[PDB]
């Protein structure tokens, strides 16, 4: 029943329904033995999911002597917490405990990419490094952010500029968390799923095109007492998620510290992050990546690398899931009331892209749905980039 | 003429006289090819040594097209800079350049352990990691801090609580920097040399006992125009330094992330760091380690592990170099005018020691000069520690 996926030579990804309720606590106490467990989550999630876990935990810790402690930290939800200040706050709190959290500490990231990125980075530098596990609660985290070990905080200048590669000891993907995920967040996560399919398999991309309606309806439907939101589409949903997770695992395993191949997971992100730096926190990450994918596909077509028919196909697939495909989208306009991305500000933000080689900007170019132009991001001239943003 | 030492499977340590003047710039441009070099140093050192390097640099960069840039950052000297604030300042400055410093950036740490620790930590998390090289300018850095890859900042609660293991690409040990080192700093560095000898070789320790007078006199002597401070003792000095560097390299190579053997380099540091947290910045690191070594040797004798004659021998060797051997030392008293280390405050600081296993404090115990009790720090009861501090 539990699907296991290996990454970087270790079988650390465990995926199934109900792992949180009756699996994680027990597995932690045995595979990640420690005297101190630190749970980091945000206030939205904390109130919904920590209770049953404290219980399951005490039940399993009782067996052990001396019994391990569980310390909980609740942070403000949203991109605002991915900051230097929040990192320092969690550190100081951990160092303040009695006794202080030491190097045997096991940190638990219970949440989406904001909590995962922040918690992973704290873990990576706490007394120079402690173990942590990821428990993704959003669709975006399950399929992308919780896997791979990249952690980071933002700064006023831009996205993920300070961080570290620090692999989690375990990654628990419990599909049950999606039951309570808001519709906008769920759609936001599909952008990474679509991105992953587009750089790896025409087939998977086709599958996403064919299940759009079915998925979107289950997500927007009103659930009656007793039934589950994804009642008749669990198999479909699980397949789409594991397909994304597996491909990411293969890529991370082949180029952990991004010397080449890993650049591909950044498709749509060169333009997407430049946009996010300006529109956050009103506009989400997946929504910015969606616009970035269309713009980067256009750039590839502009360079004679990608077919125009391919671009239209990417746009319609994104539109089919409710994701924005341009800065002129209606929502973007109202949600970012009083915010505009000028071509120059965007070009400025792109000079901060971590894939850039010195002053040369690098972008992932698709030659076809499921086929990258190269197994790395390519050098593109500023002039060419400007024409696509105009 | 250039002595090379391997560490962690790489020949990265280069030691000789004059490397800074006519070796580093050229070696950087060829072995650490990049468009951006960032030099971090403090104000004391900057004014003395950066000038000739800018020159040597431009001379070697000229050959290259496009020519690489050299950006210089000058920080306030002292333990005060090893802070979160200074780390954020350097990061923001680097991200503010035009164009921004990217992932090809090569950071140069020109200074002692304060600059090395801070710069190494910045490098470790900048865009998730960039290359850096160490150019130790103090005796303590040459023989200890610049080697091994441990980086960190302090917090009000204590020493090196946040940091990372990040190995430098090169380590350049230019003995010429010692010409301008203040006497107190030089003596401060001997504490790490003595510590290294005591955990590895009775012979080396003996050598240190026999050259004390000769070394101390050269260090305190008034140098005439034209002559060098270490005129007739270069061979002696070089041997003592390389002996320390080599042993550290062996240990780091055997246990990089401190799972066991590396604990040994922390001899005198369990009590030494607890003292430093209180007496810094008035009292230096080596001075605190000196007191910590005597206290930890006493603890080992208390546990029936070390001979009393061995303790006296450690005390006399430290005294012979001018290092303090107790909190009652005259200097400590006047320099820390209005500061006292109570047994409880010290015990509190020791609960934050990174070697501790959960609530169990771990200390390195010597069974004899040159012979550790175990190849790791040992668990010691609080009661036993208290009797030695009383
Ligand atoms: N490290 C990586 O590899 C990586 C990969 C992609 C994206 N990211 C980062 O991920 C971040 C975005 O993450 P995200 O979209 O998961 O956002 P998030 O963590 O802020 O979670 C989205 C929202 O949903 C709430 N929520 C979470 N799970 C819920 C659940 N099951 N039920 C109800 N409410 C729930 C949260 O409180 C929050 O408000 C960005 O900062 C982005 O840069 C990082
Ligand atoms: N990372 C490690 O493995 C490690 C190992 C041991 C000690 N340390 C850390 O090292 C730090 C202490 O380092 P330090 O004693 O080198 O101090 P430091 O870097 O502050 O330098 C000491 C002083 O000498 C000046 N100076 C440096 N080189 C000079 C030179 N050649 N000529 C003239 N003036 C010079 C500096 O400006 C400063 O004022 C502590 O913070 C300690 O925790 C870290
Ligand atoms: O390598 C990865 O895992 C990513 O490219 C990492 C990026 C963030 P980065 O560009 O800051 O590395 C993320 O947004 C993307 O979805 C997946
Ligand atoms: O492992 C090391 O290199 C050290 O033990 C590292 C410590 C600092 P740490 O106890 O913070 O690791 C240092 O002071 C000591 O001289 C050498
Ligand atoms: Cl940090
Ligand atoms: Zn992303
Ligand atoms: Zn030390």
UniProtKB/Swiss-Prot annotation, chains A, B:
7-phospho-2-dehydro-3-deoxy-D-arabino-heptonate binds at residues 128, 144, 150, 160, 192-195, 248, 262-266, 269, 285, 354. Residues 1-382 are annotated as: 3-dehydroquinate synthase. It is found in: Cytoplasm. The active site is at residues 258, 273. Zn(2+) binds at residues 192, 269, 285. NAD(+) binds at residues 42-44, 79-82, 112-114, 117, 137-138, 159, 177-180, 188. In the N-terminal section; belongs to the sugar phosphate cyclases superfamily. Dehydroquinate synthase family. In the 2nd section; belongs to the EPSP synthase family. The AROM polypeptide catalyzes 5 consecutive enzymatic reactions in prechorismate polyaromatic amino acid biosynthesis. Homodimer. This is Pentafunctional AROM polypeptide. It comes from Emericella nidulans (strain FGSC A4 / ATCC 38163 / CBS 112.46 / NRRL 194 / M139) (Aspergillus nidulans). The chain holds residues 3 to 392 of 1583 of the full protein.
């Amino acid at each position: 029943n539990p699907t296991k996926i290996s990454i970087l030579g270790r079988e650390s990804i465990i995926a199934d329904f109900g792992l949180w309720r009756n699996y994680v606590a027990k597995d932690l106490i045995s595979d990640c033995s420690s005297t101190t467990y630190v749970l980091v989550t945000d206030t939205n999630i904390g109130s919904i999911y920590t209770p049953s876990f404290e219980e399951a935990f005490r039940k399993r810790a009782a067996e052990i002597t001396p019994s391990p402690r569980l310390l909980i930290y609740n942070r403000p939800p949203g991109e605002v917490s991915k900051s230097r200040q929040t990192k320092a706050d969690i550190e100081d709190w951990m160092l303040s405990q009695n006794p202080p959290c030491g190097r045997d500490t096991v940190v638990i990231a219970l949440g989406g990419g904001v909590i995962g990125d922040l918690t992973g980075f704290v873990a990576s530098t706490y007394m120079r490094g402690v173990r942590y596990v990821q428990v993704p609660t959003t669709l975006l985290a399950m399929v992308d952010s919780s896997i791979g070990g990249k952690t980071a905080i933002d700064t006023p200048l831009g996205k993920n500029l300070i961080g570290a590669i620090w692999q989690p000891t375990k990654i628990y993907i419990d599909l049950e968390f999606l039951e309570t995920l808001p519709v906008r967040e769920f759609i936001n996560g599909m952008a990474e799923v679509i991105k992953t399919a587009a750089i790896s398999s025409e087939e998977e991309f086709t599958a996403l095109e064919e299940n759009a309606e079915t998925i979107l309806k289950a997500v927007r439907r009103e659930v009656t007492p007793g039934e589950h939101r994804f009642e008749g589409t669990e198999e479909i949903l699980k397949a789409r998620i594991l397909a994304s997770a597996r491909h990411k695992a293969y890529v991370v395993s082949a180029d952990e510290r991004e010397g080449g191949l890993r650049n591909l997971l950044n498709w749509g992100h060169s333009i997407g992050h430049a946009i996010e730096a300006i529109l956050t926190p009103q506009i989400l990450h997946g929504e910015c990546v969606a616009i970035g994918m269309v713009k980067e596909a256009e750039l590839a077509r502009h360079l004679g690398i990608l077919k125009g028919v391919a671009v239209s196909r990417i746009v319609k697939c994104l539109a089919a899931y409710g994701l924005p495909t341009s800065l002129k989208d209606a929502r973007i306009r109202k949600l970012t009331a009083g915010k505009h991305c000028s071509v120059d500000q965007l070009m400025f933000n792109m000079a901060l892209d971590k894939k850039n080689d010195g002053p040369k900007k690098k972008i992932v170019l698709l030659s076809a749905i499921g086929t990258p132009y190269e197994t790395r991001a390519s050098v593109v001239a500023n002039e060419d980039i400007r024409v696509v943003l105009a």
